Amino acid sequence: GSSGSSGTMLRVRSRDGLERVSVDGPHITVSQLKTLIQDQLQIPIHNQTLSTNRNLLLAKSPSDFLAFTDMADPNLRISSLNLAHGSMVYLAYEGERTIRGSGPSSG
């Protein structure tokens, strides 16, 4: 809950269902993106598979996912596809997610 600063939200599509993740902007790179979804969806970047095509939901094998190499570069910026607060995306990961956890403490 912050006032003034406007957060960015994107609509990701997975095999489990359409999900959403919070981002900052284009200034962020795939590395930061995956990380976000990695800290949100609790999915590993080594598994996370970004793709601006619904055909990603088709890929069942690993090689198939290798077909989508648009957002593989961690140095690549989302600006490459121009994702705005509303744009759509498709996520794809192997296996399952992980376990979340966080403990905010003021030291």
Q: What is the DSSP string of 40-103?
A: HS---TTT---BSSGGGGT--SHHHHTT--SS--TT-BGGGT---TT-EEE---SS--------
Structure tokens at 71: 């957002």
Structure tokens at 13: 């599509």
Which technique was the structure solved with, according to the deposited record?
NMR
Question: Whole-angstrom Cα distance, residue 1 to residue 37?
Answer: 20
Domains of the chain, each with CATH number or no CATH: 1-107 (3.10.20.90)
Question: Whole-angstrom Cα distance, residue 51 to residue 55?
Answer: 8
Residue with tokens 């990603």: 56
Question: Whole-angstrom Cα distance, residue 13 to residue 69?
Answer: 17
Question: Whole-angstrom Cα distance, residue 46 to residue 38?
Answer: 10
